[PDB]
């Protein structure tokens, strides 16, 4: 399974550096943008924490949260325990931590992992208003032993790349890191302009 993920990252991530690094933050924001293409998800948030660790909001439907017959687990734990816009599990495999947080039907579904492996079941934690998916991970420094420091420029040079070719969608990358705090919105309009 999974462990075959930490074990030889090479041939999930293409490269354990710099570059791999900056891989898992669009691992996960391909799925937000699938969201978007879907039609449900309008606006997606990339933050990158004081911690250098990655937080990746959306506002689409929350990832199913239902137990799968084949499985007996809800859908939402095998999108990140199980190797398959089929990414997010080696994401989890490759940090020290995960945490999903499913925003739908006025319920907030949290669960979490530590490098790859579950810590509880998903629970309910909260109500809510709003719908959508925010995954925020730890990205690991036993893999990426190079670097873990994230570069906003380059971060923010693919989110401006994506909100042009997905024209409509509202996407941010904002940097929380001290002495740096920045944030920079994009969206190019639709058939409104
Ligand atoms: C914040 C990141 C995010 N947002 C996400 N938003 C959705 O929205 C839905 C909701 N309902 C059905 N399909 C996708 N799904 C997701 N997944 C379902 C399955 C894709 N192949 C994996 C991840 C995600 C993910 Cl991961």
């Known amino acids: 399974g999974l462990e075959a993920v930490r074990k030889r990252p090479g041939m999930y ?3 354990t550096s710099g570059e791999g690094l900056h891989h898992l933050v669009w691992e996960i924001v391909d799925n937000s943008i699938d969201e978007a293409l879907a039609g449900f998800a309008k606006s997606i948030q990339v933050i990158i924490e004081p911690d250098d660790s990655i937080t990746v909001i959306d506002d689409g439907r929350g990832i199913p949260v239902g137990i799968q017959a084949k499985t007996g687990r809800p859908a ?3 999108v990140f ?3 398959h816009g089929v990414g997010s599990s080696v994401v ?3 940090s020290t931590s995960l945490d999903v947080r ?3 039907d006025g319920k907030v579904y949290y669960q979490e992992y530590r490098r790859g492996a579950v810590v509880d079941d998903l629970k309910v934690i ?3 208003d709003r719908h959508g998916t925010t995954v925020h991970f730890i990205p690991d420094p036993e893999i990426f032993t190079e670097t873990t420091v994230y570069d906003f420029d380059k971060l923010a040079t693919r989110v401006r790349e994506l909100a ?3 024209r409509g969608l509202h996407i941010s990358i904002e940097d929380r890191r001290e002495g740096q705090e920045d944030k920079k919105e994009y ?3 639709g058939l409104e302009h």
């Open 13 to 15: 991530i293409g490269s």
């Open 76 to 78: 939402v734990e095998t």
């Open 81 to 83: 325990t199980v190797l």
């Open 92 to 94: 989890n495999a490759l």
């Open 102 to 104: 499913v925003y739908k």
């Open 126 to 128: 909260e109500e809510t």
């Open 164 to 166: 042009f070719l997905n």
């Open 187 to 189: 969206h190019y309009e």
